[PDB]
Amino acid sequence: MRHRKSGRQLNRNSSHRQAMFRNMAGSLVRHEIIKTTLPKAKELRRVVEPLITLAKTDSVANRRLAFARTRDNEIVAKLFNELGPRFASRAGGYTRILKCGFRAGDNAPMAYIELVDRS
């Protein structure tokens, strides 16, 4: 029973979910809209949006923290150069979930996770 628990498992062990959500947060930052399943998109909000709150303070420390979350210098140089002052005034909710139907290969509920200030 998962009374008051939080976090999805996604049929993946711990060292894969931390790696996959790193490869996925580092792709939502780069292209600003990606396409994924709906259970994977409601759990990427819990990863990406603390990386933009981490981007609202351009310190040497937060550069070194956000490189521990992404391990990509191009992402950290987009989080703090571009996405930092873009969401400098939004109180959370930096992203948006858009359900886009069902996938042909396995009938999965797909979705578009995008950034808010994109278009």
Binding site: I33, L98, K99, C100, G101, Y112, E114
Partner: protein, 56 residues
């Protein structure tokens, strides 16, 4: 671990009483593009609640 008699086509059809599919109840019409989609989903041409949420 196995049957002892052949179950009839009556007992077989009674088990399939609940296998019937539930058809979609509401297909919301988009207010700008005028095309039908699923309620709370985007359309097939990238609209959702009027605005163009994603290009093609």
């Amino acid at each position: 671990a196995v049957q002892q008699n052949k179950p009839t086509r009556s007992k077989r059809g009674m088990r399939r009483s609940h296998d019937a599919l539930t058809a979609v109840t509401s297909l919301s019409v988009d207010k700008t593009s005028g095309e039908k989609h699923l309620r709370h989903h985007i359309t097939a041409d990238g609209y959702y609640r009027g605005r163009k949420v994603i290009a093609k």
